């Protein structure tokens, strides 16, 4: 695919995460758990619903056929009439099928763009206070309660405020 994320460096989804489309699974001393990133999910539920309404409204003015009748010595214009009406039904049938194929292709790659951007969102936040495992998981270098995990999800995580305990730990691995 166009993306590398869904069915990529992250393989498979979480059946246990049933609150949104995108979010977090954390695993520390205070047990495990899931959390949905609403903001990125909100732009996604709003983004796709804009799409489906625009396509419906672009099609409200579309060819409508009406019956006309002809006698036995009007074969030529009867044939004109039939070929013209058939012609428009083929044109608009092509227009709808091809449009659904094209926007299906973008919709799937759209969710995918949002997964990679969210992953890149936190990788840019933590930096050298964590390790990239390479499958969507980050194992960081200090301890995080149930208000630290919260600080990254609302994007406030102060990097140097945890740099030291981390600095100690990566030197301990460097031992």
């Amino acid at each position: 695919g166009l993306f590398g994320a869904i069915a990529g460096f992250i393989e498979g989804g979480w059946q246990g995460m049933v609150d949104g489309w995108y979010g977090y699974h954390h695993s520390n001393e205070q047990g495990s758990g899931y959390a949905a990133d609403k903001e990125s999910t909100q732009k996604a539920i709003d983004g796709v619903t804009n799409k489906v309404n625009s396509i419906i409204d672009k099609m409200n003015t579309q060819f409508e056929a009406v019956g006309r009748e002809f006698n036995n010595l009007e074969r030529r214009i009867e044939n004109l009439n039939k070929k013209m009406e058939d012609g428009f039904l083929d044109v608009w049938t092509y227009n709808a099928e091809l449009l659904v194929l094209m926007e299906n292709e973008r919709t799937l790659d759209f969710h995918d763009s949002n997964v990679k951007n969210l992953y890149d969102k936190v990788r840019l936040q933590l930096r050298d206070n964590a390790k990239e495992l390479g499958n969507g998981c980050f194992e960081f270098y200090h301890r995080c309660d149930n208000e630290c995990m919260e600080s990254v999800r609302n994007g406030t995580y102060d990097y140097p405020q945890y740099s030291e305990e981390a600095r100690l730990k990566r030197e301990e691995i460097s031992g």
């Binding site: 059946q15 995460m17 019956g67 039904l89 299906n104 270098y141």
Partner: protein, 323 residues
């Protein structure tokens, strides 16, 4: 040692729905939306509150002229659209043709309401016989004729020249109908109308017509070698129509006031009334849907979805689902 962790991921579920794309077919997805209505109720219904005019085995020609087997429609109320069979059985009961029939039909599909009136009473024909009848037009086992026109024949042994006129003092326009009879030979001609060489003249502010019978021998149709040929005009308010004839004249008795115009159509269908109500009607059934597309039939009326020839149209709304 393992420290604390955090991971990023996406939703999955037990969906089995598939969408297509141009590079790949049958892709399973978490959430999808079908946008194609594929079902109808198989009935003919009211459009909003308004009932259609359902002819049975009667054709448009049969109704307007008043084929005796079509007495159900002698006075119809306002309709929403019209339904007609492919090959109605009750059409022109006496053999012949209907001049400019397809143009009358097109006009009819711009009309929602007629109100029939009598323009020349059957008891005004005092020097001719106004009781013509044929076995090709039966009513209750006995011979009859069209109810909206009259077959005039000789009285005593004479057919005086007819001069009759009618002024449309109504505010709305009138649909007027008449005909001419083509006999089989010279002998039959003199028995019916006395005079051997005849004509029909019809005049209006815009119509200037002259008809002469064609006397000759033709194949038998329902046992007859004679023919009847019919005509129509729209007589505008405050105009007058003029008839003059010395034979073979099939004269007007009733005509139609055009009371309401609007969107209507003539549907070709074998169905009958279904005692239901809808906002979208097709020749094979009605539609109650919110889908933007449908694929039931291209000839529809009312507030409908758009027609396409597709078997499937389903939109991906969610994301790709893990096996």
């Amino acid at each position: 040692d393992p420290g604390d962790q955090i991971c990023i991921g996406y939703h999955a579920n037990n969906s089995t729905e598939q969408v297509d794309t141009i590079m790949e077919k049958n892709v399973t997805v978490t959430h999808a939306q079908d946008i194609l209505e594929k079902t109808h109720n198989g009935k003919l219904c009211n459009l909003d509150g308004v009932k259609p005019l359902i002819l049975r085995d009667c054709s448009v020609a049969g109704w307007l002229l008043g084929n005796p087997m079509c007495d159900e429609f002698l006075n119809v109320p306002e309709w929403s659209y019209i339904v007609e069979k492919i090959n109605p059985a009750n059409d022109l009961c006496y053999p012949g043709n209907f001049n400019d029939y397809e143009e009358l039909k097109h006009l009819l599909s711009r009309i929602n309401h007629f109100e029939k009136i009598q323009i020349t009473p059957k008891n005004s024909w005092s020097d001719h016989e106004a009781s013509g009848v044929s076995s090709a037009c039966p009513y209750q086992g006995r011979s009859s004729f069209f109810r909206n026109v009259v077959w005039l024949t000789k009285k005593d042994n004479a057919y005086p020249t007819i001069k009759r006129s009618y002024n449309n003092t109504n505010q709305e326009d009138l649909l007027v109908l008449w005909g001419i009879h083509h006999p089989n030979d010279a002998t039959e001609q003199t028995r019916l109308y006395q005079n051997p060489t005849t004509y029909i003249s019809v005049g209006t502010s815009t119509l200037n017509q002259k008809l002469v019978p064609k006397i000759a021998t033709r194949s038998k149709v329902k046992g007859l070698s004679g023919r009847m040929e019919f005509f129509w005009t729209i007589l505008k308010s405050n105009d007058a129509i003029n008839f003059e004839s010395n034979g073979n004249f099939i004269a007007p008795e009733n005509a139609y006031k055009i009371v309401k115009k609007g969107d209507s159509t003539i549907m070709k269908s074998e169905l009958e009334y279904g005692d239901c109500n809808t906002k979208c009607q097709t020749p094979i059934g009605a539609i109650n849907s919110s889908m933007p597309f449908h694929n039931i039939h291209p000839l529809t009326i009312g507030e409908c979805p758009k027609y396409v020839k597709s078997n499937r149209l389903v939109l991906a709304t969610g994301l790709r689902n893990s096996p």
